[PDB]
Amino acid sequence: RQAITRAMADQARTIRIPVHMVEVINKLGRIQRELLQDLGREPTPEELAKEMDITPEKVLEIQQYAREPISLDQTIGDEGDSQLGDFIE
DNA sequence: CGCCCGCTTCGGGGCAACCCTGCGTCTAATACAAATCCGGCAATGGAGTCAAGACCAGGTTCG
Numbered sequence: 386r387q388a389i390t391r392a393m394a395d396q397a398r399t400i401r402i403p404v405h406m407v408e409v410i411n412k413l414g415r416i417q418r419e420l421l422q423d424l425g426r427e428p429t430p431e432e433l434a435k436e437m438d439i440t441p442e443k444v445l446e447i448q449q450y451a452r453e454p455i456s457l458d459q460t461i462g463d464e465g466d467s468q469l470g471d472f473i474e
Numbered sequence: 475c476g477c478c479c480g481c482t483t484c485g486g487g488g489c490a491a492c493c494c495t496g497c498g499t500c501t502a503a504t505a506c507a508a509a510t511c512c513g514g515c516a517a518t519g520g521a522g523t524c525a526a527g528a529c530c531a532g533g534t535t536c537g
Contacts, residue, residue, distance in 0.1 A: 386501075390501090390502095408502085408503085411499090411500090412502095414499075415499075415500085418499065
């Protein structure tokens with residue numbers, strides 16, 4: 386389980402993210418899931434920073450780092466002839 | 475007169491090329507070492523700056 390989790394931390398993302406940032410991102414996701422099931426709504430980021438013993442700007446930095454990239458090979462418009470990369474100035 | 479045996483003819487199978495009847499959350503850390511950022515003095519040394527101050531040369535004024 387150690388080697389499988391380490392390989393999932395290494396190779397499962399497009400841009401590479403180190404192990405401790407992956408750990409705190411998964412911690413943030415688990416705590417947000419628990420607070421969503423408990424409170425019933427989406428938690429405030431200051432409440433998340435209160436829960437995770439860190440600062441809300443660090444919470445915002447982690448939420449910025451967690452954003453996976455989107456692909457350029459889908460169809461934006463109704464017709465499939467228009468790919469996504471043909472509307473980027 | 476009947477009989478084998480490959481040659482051609484069609485069937486069926488098999489396969490290659492395109493769409494949606496397609497389109498999940500997961501142990502959890504510690505310990506340590508190396509690399510790197512960065513913050514703050516601590517030597518500068520060269521490059522810019524102010525000011526004096528001298529250098530005549532030819533208009534300009536005066537004799």
